[PDB]
Each structure stands twice: as C-alpha cells, then as structure tokens.
Short mmCIF file of C-alpha atoms and ligand atoms in Angstrom, two decimals:
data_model
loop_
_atom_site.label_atom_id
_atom_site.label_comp_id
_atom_site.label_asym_id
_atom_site.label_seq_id
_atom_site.Cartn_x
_atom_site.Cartn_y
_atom_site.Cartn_z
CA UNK A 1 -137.19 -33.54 -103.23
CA UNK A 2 -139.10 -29.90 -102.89
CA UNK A 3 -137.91 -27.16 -105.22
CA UNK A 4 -137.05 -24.14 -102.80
CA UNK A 5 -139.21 -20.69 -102.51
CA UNK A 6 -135.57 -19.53 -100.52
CA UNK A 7 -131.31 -19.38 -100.74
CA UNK A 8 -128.96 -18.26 -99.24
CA UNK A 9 -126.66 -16.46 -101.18
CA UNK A 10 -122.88 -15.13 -99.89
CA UNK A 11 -121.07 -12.11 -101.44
CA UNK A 12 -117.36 -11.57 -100.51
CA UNK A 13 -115.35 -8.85 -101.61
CA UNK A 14 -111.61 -8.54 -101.44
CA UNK A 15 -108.76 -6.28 -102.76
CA UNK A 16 -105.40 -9.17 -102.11
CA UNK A 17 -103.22 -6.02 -102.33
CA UNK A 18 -101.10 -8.43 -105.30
CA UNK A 19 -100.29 -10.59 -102.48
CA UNK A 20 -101.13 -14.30 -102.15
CA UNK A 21 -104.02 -14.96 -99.37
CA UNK A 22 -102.93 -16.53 -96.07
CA UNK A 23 -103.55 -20.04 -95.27
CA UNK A 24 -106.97 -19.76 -93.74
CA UNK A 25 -109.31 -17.61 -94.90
CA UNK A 26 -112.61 -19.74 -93.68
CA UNK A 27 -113.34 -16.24 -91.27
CA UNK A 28 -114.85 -14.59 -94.63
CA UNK A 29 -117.06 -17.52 -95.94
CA UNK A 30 -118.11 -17.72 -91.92
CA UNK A 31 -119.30 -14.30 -91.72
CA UNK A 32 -117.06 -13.51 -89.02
CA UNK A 33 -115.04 -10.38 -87.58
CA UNK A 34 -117.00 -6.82 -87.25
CA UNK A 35 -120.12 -5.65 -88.28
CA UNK A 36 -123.30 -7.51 -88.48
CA UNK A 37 -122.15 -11.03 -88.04
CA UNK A 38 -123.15 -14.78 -88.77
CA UNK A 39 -124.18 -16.74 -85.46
CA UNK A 40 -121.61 -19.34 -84.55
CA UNK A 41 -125.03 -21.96 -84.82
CA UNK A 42 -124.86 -21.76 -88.13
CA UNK A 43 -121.58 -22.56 -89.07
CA UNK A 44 -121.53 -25.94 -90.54
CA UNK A 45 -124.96 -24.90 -92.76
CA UNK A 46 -123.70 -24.55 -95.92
CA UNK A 47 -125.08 -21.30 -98.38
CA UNK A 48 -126.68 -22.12 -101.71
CA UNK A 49 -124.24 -19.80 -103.70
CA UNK A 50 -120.84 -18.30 -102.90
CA UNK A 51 -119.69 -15.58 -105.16
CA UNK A 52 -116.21 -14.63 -104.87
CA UNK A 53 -115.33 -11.18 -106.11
CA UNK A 54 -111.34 -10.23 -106.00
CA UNK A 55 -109.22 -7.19 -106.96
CA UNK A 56 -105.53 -7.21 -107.38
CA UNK A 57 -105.92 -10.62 -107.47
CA UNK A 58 -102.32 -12.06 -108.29
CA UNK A 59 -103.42 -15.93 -108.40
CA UNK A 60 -104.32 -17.92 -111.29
CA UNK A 61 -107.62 -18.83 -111.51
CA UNK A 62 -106.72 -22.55 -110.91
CA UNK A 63 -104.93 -21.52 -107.76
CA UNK A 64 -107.92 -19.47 -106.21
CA UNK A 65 -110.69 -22.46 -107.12
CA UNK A 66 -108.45 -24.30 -105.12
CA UNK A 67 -108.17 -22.16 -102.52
CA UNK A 68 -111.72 -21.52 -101.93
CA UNK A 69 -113.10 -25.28 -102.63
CA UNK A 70 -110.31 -26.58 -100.11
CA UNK A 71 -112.11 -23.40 -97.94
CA UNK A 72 -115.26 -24.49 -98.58
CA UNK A 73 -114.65 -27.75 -98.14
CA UNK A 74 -113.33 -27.66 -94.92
CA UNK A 75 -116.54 -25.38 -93.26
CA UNK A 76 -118.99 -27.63 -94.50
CA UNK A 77 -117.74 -30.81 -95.70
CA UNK A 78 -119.10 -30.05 -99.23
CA UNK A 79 -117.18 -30.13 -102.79
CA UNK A 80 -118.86 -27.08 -104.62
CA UNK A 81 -119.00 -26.90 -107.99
CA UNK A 82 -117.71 -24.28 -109.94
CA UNK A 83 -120.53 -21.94 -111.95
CA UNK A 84 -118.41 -19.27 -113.67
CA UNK A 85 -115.09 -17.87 -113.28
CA UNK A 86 -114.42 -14.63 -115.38
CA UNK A 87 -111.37 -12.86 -114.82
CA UNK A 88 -110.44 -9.44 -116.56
CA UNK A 89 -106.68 -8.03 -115.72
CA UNK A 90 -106.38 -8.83 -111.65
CA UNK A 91 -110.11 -8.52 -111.12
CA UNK A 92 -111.84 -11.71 -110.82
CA UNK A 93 -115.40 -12.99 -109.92
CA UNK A 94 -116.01 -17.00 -109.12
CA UNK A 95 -119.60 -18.53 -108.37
CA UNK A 96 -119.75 -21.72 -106.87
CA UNK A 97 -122.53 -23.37 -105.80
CA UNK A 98 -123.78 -26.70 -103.47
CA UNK A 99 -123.86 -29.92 -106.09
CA UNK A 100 -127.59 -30.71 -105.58
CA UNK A 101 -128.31 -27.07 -107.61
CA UNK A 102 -126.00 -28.18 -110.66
CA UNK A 103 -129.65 -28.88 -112.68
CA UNK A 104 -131.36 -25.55 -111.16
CA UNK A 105 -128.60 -23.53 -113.16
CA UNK A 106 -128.74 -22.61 -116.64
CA UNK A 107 -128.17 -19.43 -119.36
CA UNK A 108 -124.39 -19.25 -117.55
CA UNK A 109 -123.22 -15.70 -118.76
CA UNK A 110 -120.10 -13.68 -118.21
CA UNK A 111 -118.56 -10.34 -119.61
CA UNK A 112 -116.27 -7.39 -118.35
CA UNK A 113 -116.28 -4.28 -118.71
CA UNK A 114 -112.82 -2.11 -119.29
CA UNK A 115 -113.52 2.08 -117.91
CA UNK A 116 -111.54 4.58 -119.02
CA UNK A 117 -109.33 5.99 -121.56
CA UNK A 118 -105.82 6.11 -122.39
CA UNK A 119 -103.95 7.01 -119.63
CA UNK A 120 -106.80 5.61 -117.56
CA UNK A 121 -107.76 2.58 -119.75
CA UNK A 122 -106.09 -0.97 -118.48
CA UNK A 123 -106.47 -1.76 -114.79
CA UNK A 124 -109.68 -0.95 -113.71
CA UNK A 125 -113.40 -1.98 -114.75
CA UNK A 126 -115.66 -4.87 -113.75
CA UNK A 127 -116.45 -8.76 -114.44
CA UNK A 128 -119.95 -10.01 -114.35
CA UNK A 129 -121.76 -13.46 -114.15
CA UNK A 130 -125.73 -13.87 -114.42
CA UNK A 131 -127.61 -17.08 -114.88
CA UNK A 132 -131.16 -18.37 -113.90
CA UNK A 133 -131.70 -20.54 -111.02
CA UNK A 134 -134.72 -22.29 -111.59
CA UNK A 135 -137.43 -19.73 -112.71
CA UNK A 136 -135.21 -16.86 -110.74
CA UNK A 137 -132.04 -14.53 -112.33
CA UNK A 138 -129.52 -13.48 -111.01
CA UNK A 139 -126.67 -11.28 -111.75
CA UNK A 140 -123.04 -10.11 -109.99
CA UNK A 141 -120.96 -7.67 -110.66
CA UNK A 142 -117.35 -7.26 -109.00
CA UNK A 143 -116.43 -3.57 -110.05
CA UNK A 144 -112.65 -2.14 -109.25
CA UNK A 145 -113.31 1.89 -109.43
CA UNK A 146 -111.25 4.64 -110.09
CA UNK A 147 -108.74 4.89 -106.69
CA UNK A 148 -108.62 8.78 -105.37
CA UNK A 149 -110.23 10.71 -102.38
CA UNK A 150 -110.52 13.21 -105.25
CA UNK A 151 -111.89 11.08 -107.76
CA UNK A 152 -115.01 10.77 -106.66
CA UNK A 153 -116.79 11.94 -110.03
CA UNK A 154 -114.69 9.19 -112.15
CA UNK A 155 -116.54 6.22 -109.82
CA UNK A 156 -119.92 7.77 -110.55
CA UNK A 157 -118.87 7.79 -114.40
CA UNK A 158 -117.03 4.35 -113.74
CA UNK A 159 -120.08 2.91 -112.73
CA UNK A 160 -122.59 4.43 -115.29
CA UNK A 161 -120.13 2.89 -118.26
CA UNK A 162 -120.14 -0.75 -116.35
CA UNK A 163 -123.90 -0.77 -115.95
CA UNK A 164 -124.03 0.68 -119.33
CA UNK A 165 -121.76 -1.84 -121.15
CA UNK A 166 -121.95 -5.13 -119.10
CA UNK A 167 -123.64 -7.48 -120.86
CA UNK A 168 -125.30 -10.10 -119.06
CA UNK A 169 -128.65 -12.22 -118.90
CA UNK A 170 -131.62 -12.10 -121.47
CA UNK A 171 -130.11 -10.56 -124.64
CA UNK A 172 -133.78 -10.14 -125.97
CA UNK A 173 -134.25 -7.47 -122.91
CA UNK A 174 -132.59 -5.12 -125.32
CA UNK A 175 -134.01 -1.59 -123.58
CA UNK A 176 -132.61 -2.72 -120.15
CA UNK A 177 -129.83 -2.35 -118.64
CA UNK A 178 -128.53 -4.81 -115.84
CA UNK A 179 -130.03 -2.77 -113.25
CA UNK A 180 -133.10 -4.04 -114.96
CA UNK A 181 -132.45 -7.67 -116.39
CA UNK A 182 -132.23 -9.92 -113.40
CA UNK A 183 -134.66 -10.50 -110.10
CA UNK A 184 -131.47 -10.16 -107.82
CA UNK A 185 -128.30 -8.02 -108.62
CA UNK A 186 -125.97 -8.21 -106.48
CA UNK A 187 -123.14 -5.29 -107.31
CA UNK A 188 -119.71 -5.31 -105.02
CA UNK A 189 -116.23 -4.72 -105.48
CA UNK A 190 -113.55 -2.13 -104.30
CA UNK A 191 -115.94 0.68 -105.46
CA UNK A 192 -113.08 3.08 -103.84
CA UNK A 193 -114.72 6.02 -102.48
CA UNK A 194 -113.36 7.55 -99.41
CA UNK A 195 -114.38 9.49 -96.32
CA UNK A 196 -114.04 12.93 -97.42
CA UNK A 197 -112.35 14.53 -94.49
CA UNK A 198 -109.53 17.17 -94.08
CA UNK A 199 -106.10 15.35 -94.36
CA UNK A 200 -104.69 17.28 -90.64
CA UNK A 201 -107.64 15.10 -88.92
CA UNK A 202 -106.40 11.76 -90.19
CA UNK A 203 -105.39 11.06 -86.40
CA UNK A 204 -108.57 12.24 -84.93
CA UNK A 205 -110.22 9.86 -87.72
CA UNK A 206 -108.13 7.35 -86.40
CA UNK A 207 -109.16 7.71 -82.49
CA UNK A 208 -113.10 7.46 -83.65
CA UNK A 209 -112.23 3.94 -85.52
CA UNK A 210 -110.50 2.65 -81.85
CA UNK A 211 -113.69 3.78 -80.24
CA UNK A 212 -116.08 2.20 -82.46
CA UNK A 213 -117.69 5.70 -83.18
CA UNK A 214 -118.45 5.61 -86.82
CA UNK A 215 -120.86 7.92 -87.22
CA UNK A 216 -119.21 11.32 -87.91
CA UNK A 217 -116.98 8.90 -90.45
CA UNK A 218 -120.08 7.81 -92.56
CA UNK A 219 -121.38 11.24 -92.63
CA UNK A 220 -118.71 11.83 -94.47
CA UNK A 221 -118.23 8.33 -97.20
CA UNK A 222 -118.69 9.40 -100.48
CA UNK A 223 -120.73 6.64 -101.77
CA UNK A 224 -123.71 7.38 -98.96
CA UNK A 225 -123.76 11.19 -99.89
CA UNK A 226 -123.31 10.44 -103.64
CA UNK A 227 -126.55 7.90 -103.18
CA UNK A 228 -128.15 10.49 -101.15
CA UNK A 229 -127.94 13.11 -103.80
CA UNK A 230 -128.89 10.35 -106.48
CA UNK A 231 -125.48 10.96 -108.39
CA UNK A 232 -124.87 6.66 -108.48
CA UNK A 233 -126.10 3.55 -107.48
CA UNK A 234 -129.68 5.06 -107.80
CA UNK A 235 -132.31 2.42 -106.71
CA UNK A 236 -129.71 0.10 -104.80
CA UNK A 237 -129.89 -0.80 -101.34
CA UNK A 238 -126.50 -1.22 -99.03
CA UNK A 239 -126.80 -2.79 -95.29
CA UNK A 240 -126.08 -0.19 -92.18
CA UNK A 241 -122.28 -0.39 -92.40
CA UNK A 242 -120.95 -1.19 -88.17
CA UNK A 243 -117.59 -2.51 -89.08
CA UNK A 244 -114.09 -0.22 -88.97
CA UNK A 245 -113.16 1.20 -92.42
CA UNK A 246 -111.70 -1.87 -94.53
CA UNK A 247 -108.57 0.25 -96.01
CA UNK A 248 -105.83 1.18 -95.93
CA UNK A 249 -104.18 -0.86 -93.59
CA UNK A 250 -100.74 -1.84 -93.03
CA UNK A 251 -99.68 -5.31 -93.89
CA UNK A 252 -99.68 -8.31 -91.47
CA UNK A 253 -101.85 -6.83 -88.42
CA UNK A 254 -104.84 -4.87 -88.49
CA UNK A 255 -103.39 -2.65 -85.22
CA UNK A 256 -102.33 0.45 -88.06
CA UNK A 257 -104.01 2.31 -90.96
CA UNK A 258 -101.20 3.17 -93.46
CA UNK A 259 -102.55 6.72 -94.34
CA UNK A 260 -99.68 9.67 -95.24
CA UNK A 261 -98.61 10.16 -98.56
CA UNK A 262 -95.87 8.04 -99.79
CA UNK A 263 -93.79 7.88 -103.32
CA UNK A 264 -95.62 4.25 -103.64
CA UNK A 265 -99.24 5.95 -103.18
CA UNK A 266 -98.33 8.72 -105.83
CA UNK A 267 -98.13 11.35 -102.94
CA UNK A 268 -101.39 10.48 -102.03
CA UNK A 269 -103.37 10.69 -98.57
CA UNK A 270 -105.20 7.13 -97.85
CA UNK A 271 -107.44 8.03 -94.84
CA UNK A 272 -109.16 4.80 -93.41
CA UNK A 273 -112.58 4.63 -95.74
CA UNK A 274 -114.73 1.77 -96.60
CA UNK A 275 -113.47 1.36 -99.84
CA UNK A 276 -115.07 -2.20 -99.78
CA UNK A 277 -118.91 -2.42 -100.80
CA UNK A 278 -121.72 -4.98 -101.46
CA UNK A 279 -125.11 -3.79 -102.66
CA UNK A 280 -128.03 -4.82 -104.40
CA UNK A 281 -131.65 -4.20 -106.39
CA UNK A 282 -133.92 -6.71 -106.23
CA UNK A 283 -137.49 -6.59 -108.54
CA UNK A 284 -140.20 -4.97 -106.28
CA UNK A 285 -141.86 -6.93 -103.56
CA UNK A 286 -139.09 -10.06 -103.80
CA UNK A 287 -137.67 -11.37 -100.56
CA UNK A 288 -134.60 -10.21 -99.79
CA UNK A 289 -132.44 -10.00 -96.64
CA UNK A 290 -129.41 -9.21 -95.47
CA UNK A 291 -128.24 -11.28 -92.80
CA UNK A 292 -124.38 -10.56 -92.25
CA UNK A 293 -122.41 -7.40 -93.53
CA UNK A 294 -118.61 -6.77 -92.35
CA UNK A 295 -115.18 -7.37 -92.53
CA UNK A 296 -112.78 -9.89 -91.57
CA UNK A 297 -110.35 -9.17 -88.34
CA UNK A 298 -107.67 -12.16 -89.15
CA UNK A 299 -106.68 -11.91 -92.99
CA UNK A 300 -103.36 -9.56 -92.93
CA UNK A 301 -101.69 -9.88 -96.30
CA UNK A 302 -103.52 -7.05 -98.03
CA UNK A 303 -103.27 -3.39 -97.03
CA UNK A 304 -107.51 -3.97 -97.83
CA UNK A 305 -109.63 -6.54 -95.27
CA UNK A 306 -112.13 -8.95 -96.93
CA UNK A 307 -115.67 -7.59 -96.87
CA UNK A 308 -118.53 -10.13 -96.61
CA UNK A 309 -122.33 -9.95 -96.79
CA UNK A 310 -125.40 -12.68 -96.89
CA UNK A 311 -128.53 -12.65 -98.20
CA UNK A 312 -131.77 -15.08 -98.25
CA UNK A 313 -133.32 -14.67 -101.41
CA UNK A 314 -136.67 -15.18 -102.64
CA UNK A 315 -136.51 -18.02 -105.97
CA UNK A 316 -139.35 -19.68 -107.74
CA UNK A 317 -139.75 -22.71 -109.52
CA UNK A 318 -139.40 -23.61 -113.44
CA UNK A 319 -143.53 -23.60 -113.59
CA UNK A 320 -145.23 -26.04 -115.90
CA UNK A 321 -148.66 -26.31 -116.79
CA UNK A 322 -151.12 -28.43 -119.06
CA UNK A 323 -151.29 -24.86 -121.47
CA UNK A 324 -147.78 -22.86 -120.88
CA UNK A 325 -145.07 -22.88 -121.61
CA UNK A 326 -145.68 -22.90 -125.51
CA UNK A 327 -149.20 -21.97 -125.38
CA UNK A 328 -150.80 -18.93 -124.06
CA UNK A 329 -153.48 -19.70 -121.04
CA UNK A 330 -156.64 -17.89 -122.17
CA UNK A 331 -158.08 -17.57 -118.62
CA UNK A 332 -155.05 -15.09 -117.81
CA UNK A 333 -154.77 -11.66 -118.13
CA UNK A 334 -152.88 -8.30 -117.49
CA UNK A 335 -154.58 -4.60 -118.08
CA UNK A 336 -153.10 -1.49 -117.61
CA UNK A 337 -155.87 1.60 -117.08
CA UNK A 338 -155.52 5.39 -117.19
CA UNK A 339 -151.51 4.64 -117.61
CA UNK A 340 -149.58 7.91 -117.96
CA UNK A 341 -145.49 8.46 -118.29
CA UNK A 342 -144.42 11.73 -117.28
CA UNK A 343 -140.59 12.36 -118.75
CA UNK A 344 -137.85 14.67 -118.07
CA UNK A 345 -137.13 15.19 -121.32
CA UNK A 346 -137.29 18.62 -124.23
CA UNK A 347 -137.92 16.09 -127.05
CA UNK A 348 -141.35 16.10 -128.55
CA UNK A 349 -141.28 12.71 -130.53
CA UNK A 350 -143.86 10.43 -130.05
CA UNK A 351 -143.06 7.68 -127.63
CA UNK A 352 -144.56 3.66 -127.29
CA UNK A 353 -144.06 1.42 -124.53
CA UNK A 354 -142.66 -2.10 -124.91
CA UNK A 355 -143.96 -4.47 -122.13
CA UNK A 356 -141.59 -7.43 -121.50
CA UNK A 357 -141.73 -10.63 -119.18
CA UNK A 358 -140.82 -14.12 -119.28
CA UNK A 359 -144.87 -14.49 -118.04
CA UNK A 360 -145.06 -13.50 -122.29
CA UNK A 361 -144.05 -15.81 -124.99
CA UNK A 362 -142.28 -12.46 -126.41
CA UNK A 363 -142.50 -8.39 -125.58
CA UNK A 364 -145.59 -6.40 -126.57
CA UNK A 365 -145.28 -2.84 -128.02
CA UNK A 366 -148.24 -0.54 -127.84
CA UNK A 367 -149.62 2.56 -129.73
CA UNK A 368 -148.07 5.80 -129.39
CA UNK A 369 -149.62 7.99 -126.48
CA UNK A 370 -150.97 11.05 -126.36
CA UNK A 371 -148.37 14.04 -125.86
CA UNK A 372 -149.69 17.06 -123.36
CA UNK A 373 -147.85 19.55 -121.53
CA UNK A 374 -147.13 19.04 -118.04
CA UNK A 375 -148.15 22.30 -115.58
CA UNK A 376 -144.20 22.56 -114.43
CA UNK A 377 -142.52 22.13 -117.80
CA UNK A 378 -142.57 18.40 -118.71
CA UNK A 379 -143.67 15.91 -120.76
CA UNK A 380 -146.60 13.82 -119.74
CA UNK A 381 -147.80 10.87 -122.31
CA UNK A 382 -151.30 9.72 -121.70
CA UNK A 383 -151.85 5.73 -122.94
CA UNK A 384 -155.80 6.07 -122.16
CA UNK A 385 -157.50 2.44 -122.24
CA UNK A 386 -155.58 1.92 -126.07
CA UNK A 387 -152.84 -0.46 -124.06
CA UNK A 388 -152.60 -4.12 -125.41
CA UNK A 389 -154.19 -6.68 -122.98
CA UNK A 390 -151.30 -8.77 -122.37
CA UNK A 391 -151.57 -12.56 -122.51
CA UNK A 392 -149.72 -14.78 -120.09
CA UNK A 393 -148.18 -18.41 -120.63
CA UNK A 394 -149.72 -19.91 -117.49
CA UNK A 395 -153.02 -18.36 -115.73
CA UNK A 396 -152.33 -19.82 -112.08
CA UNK A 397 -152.05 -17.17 -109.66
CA UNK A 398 -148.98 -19.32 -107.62
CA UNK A 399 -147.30 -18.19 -110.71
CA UNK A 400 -148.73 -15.05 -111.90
CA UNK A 401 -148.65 -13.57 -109.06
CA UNK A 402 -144.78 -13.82 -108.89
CA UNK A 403 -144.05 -11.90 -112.25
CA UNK A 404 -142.93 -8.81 -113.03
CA UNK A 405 -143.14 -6.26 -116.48
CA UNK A 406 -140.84 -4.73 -117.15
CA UNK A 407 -141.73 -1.51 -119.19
CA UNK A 408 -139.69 0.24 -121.62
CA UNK A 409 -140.79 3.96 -122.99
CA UNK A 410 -139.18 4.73 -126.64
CA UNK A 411 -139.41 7.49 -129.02
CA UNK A 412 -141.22 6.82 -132.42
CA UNK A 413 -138.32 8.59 -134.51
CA UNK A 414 -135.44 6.78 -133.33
CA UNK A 415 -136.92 3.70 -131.59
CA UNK A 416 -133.93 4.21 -129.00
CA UNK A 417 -135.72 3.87 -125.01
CA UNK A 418 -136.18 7.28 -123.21
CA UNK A 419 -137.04 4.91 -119.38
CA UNK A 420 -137.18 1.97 -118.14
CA UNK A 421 -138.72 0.42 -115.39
CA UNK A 422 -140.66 -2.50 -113.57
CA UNK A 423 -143.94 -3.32 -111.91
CA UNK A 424 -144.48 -6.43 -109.80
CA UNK A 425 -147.58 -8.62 -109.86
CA UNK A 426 -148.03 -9.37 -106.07
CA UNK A 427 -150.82 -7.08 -106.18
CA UNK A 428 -153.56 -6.77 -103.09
CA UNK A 429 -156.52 -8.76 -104.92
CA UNK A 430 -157.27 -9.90 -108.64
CA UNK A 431 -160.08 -8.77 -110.90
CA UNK A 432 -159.51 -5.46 -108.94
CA UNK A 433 -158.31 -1.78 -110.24
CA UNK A 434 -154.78 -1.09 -108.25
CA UNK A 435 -152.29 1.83 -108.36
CA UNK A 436 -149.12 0.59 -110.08
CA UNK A 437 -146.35 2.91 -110.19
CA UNK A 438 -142.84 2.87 -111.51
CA UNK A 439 -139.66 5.24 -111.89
CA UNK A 440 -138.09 5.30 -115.23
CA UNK A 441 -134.21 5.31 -115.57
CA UNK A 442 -132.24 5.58 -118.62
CA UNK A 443 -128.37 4.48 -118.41
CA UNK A 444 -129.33 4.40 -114.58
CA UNK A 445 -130.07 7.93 -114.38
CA UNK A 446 -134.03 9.17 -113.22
CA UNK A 447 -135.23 10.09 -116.43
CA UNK A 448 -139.26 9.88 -115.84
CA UNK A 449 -142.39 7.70 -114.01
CA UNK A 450 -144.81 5.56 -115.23
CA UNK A 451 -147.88 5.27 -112.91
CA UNK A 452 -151.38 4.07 -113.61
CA UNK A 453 -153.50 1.34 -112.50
CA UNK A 454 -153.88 -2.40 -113.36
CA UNK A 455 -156.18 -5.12 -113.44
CA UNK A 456 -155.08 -8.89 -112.93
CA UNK A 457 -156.75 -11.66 -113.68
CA UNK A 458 -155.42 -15.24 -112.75
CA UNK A 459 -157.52 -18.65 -113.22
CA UNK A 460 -158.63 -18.07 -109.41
N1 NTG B 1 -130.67 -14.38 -116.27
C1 NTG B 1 -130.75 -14.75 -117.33
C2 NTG B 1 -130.73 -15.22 -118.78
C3 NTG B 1 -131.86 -15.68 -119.46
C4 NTG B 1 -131.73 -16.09 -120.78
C5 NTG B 1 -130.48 -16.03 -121.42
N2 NTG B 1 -130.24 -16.46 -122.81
C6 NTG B 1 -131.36 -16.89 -123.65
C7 NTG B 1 -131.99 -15.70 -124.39
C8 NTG B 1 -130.95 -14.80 -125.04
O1 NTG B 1 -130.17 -14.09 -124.11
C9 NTG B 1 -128.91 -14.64 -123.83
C10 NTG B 1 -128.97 -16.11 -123.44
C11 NTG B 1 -129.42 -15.56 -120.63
N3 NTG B 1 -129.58 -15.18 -119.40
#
C-alpha cells in the first residue's frame, strides 16, 4: 500500500454564537452553500484530515467528537479517529483523521495562547495543534480576535502575540516562530475584522449582499487592506472570498443581518463583514491548493455561518536509506555562494546565521559576516564563500530535492535572532550556481532579506 505524495485536508471555522449546533451540519464538511464550492461528485470521497476550529463553543468536548464523528460518519461511512482536541475557554480546535493514517501521525502537539490584559485578558486568544504526517508538518491555529469595527489595531497585536507565543512543532527550531516551523500552516478562526464602512450605509451594504455584488464590500474588509499594507498576516495566502459576509446574522434564517446597536452588542454597530477566515503559508515551492472556500446557507443557530475551505497538500514520505537517517551521506551536499543579509535594523553587532533542517542531523551556525553600510541607510552583512558546507542525512535527489533551510540571522552580543526565513531545494538543476532568495521576519514582522546563490549536489 503506496505512501501518498498528496491529501486532502478540510478547515472549518465556526463561531456557535453559545448555542448548541442543529441536527445536521454535514453542509460544512460537504463544502456546500456560497462561494467556491465542492462538486456534488465528490461527496462520498472522504478528506485525509478534518480540522474543526470553534468559537463560543458551548459543548463539551465529548459532545462535539460526537457530533462531528456521527457527521462524518454519515458522509462517508468512515469512523475517524480523533488526533487532538485542545480547548481553551469556548474556543476549541479538533483534528480527526481517516483510520488508515493513524501510523503516518506522530510528535501530536497542542498549546493556546491567552491575548490581552486585564480588562481584556479571559475570552479571547487561540488553540493550536501541529504534528508530522509522515515526513510532512503541519500546524493549525483557530484564533478568536479582539471583536470591534474599531478594533482593528488590537487583531493585528492579537495576532503578533499568538504567533509569538504558540508553541507548537520542533522545539529545537528555537529562532522560529510558527509561521516558520511547519511545511503547511493552516491559520483560521473568527479573526473579527469588519468592513470598514460608514454606519448610515448599513442598508445600502445590505442591498449589495442581495445582489451578490461584493466588490465595493471587500474594498473595504480590514483584514485585505491590513495584508495589503503588510500590518498582519504578512506572507499568508487567503482564497478570493465569493460568499455573502458570514456575520452578523439573526438567529434561525439567514434572510436578516442583525446590524444596529443594541444594549446586548455594547451599543455597538455589527455591519455584515466576513468576520470568518481561513488562511495559510506553506514552505516555498510545496503543492498547495485551495479547492473550496465559503460558507454554509442551512446552519441557523448562530448569529455567525460556518466557514469552510479545502486544500490538497503536497506530503512526502518518512525516507530511509542504507546511510541516513543516523549517518550523514557523503555524496550530498548544500553550498551557499556570495550570500548577503541586508537588515532593517540601527544595531551594529555582529550577526551569524544558523541553518536548520530535518535534511541535518542538527542546525549549523556559521562565522560572523562582514558588516558594510548599505547606500540607503541599512545594514548589509556579507558571508563571502566562509559559509559551512552543509551535510545532508540522505544524498538522493527524490529526497533532497524536497527540503527546505530554514535560516536564522542572530546578533553575536545577545545571540537573540534579528530574521528568519526559508529557502526550498526544488532548485532548476544540481551541481549548478542558482539565485536563492529569502525575506527575513522577526515576530512576523519584515525585518530584512537574505539572497545569494547555491549549489546542490545530490547522488545523481
Ligand atoms: N511538526 C512537528 C514536530 C516535530 C518534532 C517534535 N518533537 C520532537 C523534537 C522536539 O520538539 C518537540 C517534540 C514536535 N513536532
């Protein structure tokens, strides 16, 4: 039985409103309502991986498993097993997967991350799960942000404290972040930003959602123009959005958005917005595709809709060979060339790179580069030819080929990392010089580049 080079992964995402979920919910796992939709052909073909994210959840987690096996179940005449479940207040994330991947899944991990303080500390934040599937990682976050059309600058901080704090996958990755540790991550939730519109035109908001015009609506979402001016979610992609906004609605139809201010909403405006996201960053050059993104028309008993969104995902298999894994294999090797990091920062420390990749039996630090004044005010650090020549486990360019470095640039004095980034190995040809280039984030934030060239050479 063939390991697979492919899965299918679903991501659903829905704010219950506190209230328990109707009786059928098997629309969501089927892809089916608005938006970019599953084809009715593929109904009975079950996905590899369901993960389940939920705000205001009010169910126990028994209660939900139930609920979504018996769901699952039902579609496709499979019993799932249960991965993870990880709930933190109401906000809950479940992973389930088909039985005949129980022995492809390993390194299980979940955490949560609480935002705020005070006042604004103990209802909102994020749960996480990441684990390897075969020789593939992958991580999901379910975040509930900060709720406000005016709060728009609390998500971005929300966000930068989850991806910050969340601690999930290869603890020995310590420079990276999430946005950094896994080949997939997939990062949904009721993120909570709103279409940023006067409050008189919450009627004439309403007309454009009964004629299926969106566009003057998303020119106006505050997670599109705060990922357009590279305030959050930097790096991540998000599918064309062609369903109606997902909140607020009334309860029990989906024929009313609940918008004016009420003593329940704190005298607060709701107008409709797509509070309800899925997104993800995948390592350069790895298959991924969305195939479905939108929102359920038949679930009522939340003033939210459930959001869903597919993906087929690019995996490889747990490689063995007669050298690696617990040998290197000698005919293998990575070089970077003429390898320079230009940084944003006023600090004029000395800086090393770390080079880290499960292709490694364990990271690689270099020298310290060569400081020299960039023309327009910046720092530029020149590596020359002085960079290690790193020395994979396995040589075969089926494998090779696959990997990635990650590449970590830290300061001498304080050893603390000043960027991070990643460079694939599906290059154009071995034994070859090739532009590699990569942009260096620190706490998610552009904080540099690293661009050079490399030279790969695999047992072919
Ligand atoms: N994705 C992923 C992944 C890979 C490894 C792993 N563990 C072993 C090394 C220490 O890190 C924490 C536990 C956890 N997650």
């Amino acid at each position: 039985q063939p390991e697979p080079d492919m899965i299918t992964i679903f991501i659903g995402t829905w704010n219950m409103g506190n209230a328990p979920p109707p009786k059928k919910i098997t629309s969501w796992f089927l892809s089916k309502g608005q938006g970019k939709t599953r084809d009715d052909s593929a109904d009975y073909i079950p996905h590899d991986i369901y993960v389940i994210g939920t705000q205001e959840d009010p169910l126990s987690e028994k209660e939900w498993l139930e609920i979504l096996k018996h769901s699952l179940q039902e579609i496709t005449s499979v019993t799932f097993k249960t991965v993870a479940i990880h709930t933190l207040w109401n906000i809950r994330i479940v992973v389930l997967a088909k039985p005949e991947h129980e022995n492809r899944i390993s390194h299980i991990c979940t955490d949560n991350v609480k935002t705020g303080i005070a006042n604004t500390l103990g209802n909102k934040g994020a749960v996480g799960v990441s684990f390897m599937f075969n020789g593939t990682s992958l991580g999901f976050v379910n975040s509930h942000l900060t709720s406000g059309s005016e709060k728009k600058l609390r998500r971005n901080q929300n966000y930068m404290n989850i991806l910050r704090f969340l601690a999930l996958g290869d603890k020995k990755l310590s420079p990276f972040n999430i946005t950094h540790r896994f080949t997939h991550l997939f990062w949904f939730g009721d993120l909570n930003y709103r279409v940023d519109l006067p409050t008189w035109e919450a009627e004439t908001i309403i007309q454009k959602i009964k004629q299926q015009q969106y566009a003057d609506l998303l020119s106006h979402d505050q997670l599109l123009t705060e990922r357009r001016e590279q305030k959050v979610f930097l790096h991540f992609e998000e599918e064309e959005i062609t369903f109606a906004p997902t909140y607020r609605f009334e309860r029990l139809t989906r024929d009313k958005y609940a918008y004016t201010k009420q003593k329940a909403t704190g005298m607060k405006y709701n107008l409709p917005s797509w509070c309800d996201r899925v997104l993800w960053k995948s390592y350069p050059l790895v298959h991924v595709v969305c195939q479905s993104y939108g929102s359920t028309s038949d679930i009522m008993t939340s003033d939210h809709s459930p959001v869903f969104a597919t993906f087929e995902a690019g995996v490889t298999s747990q490689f063995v060979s007669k050298n690696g894994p617990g040998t290197v294999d000698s005919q293998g090797q990575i070089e970077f060339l003429r390898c320079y990091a230009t940084l944003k920062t006023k600090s004029q420390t000395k800086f090393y790179l770390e080079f880290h990749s499960s292709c490694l039996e364990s990271f690689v630090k270099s020298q310290e580069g060569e400081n020299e004044e960039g023309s327009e005010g910046e720092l530029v650090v020149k590596f020359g030819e002085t960079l290690p020549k790193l020395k994979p486990i396995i040589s075969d360019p089926e494998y090779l080929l696959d990997q990635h470095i990650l590449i970590s640039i830290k300061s001498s004095d304080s050893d603390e990392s000043y960027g991070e980034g990643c460079i694939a190995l599906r290059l154009e040809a071995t034994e070859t010089q090739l532009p590699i280039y990569t942009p260096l984030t620190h706490h998610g934030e552009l904080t540099g580049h690293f661009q050079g060239e490399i030279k790969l050479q695999t047992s072919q």
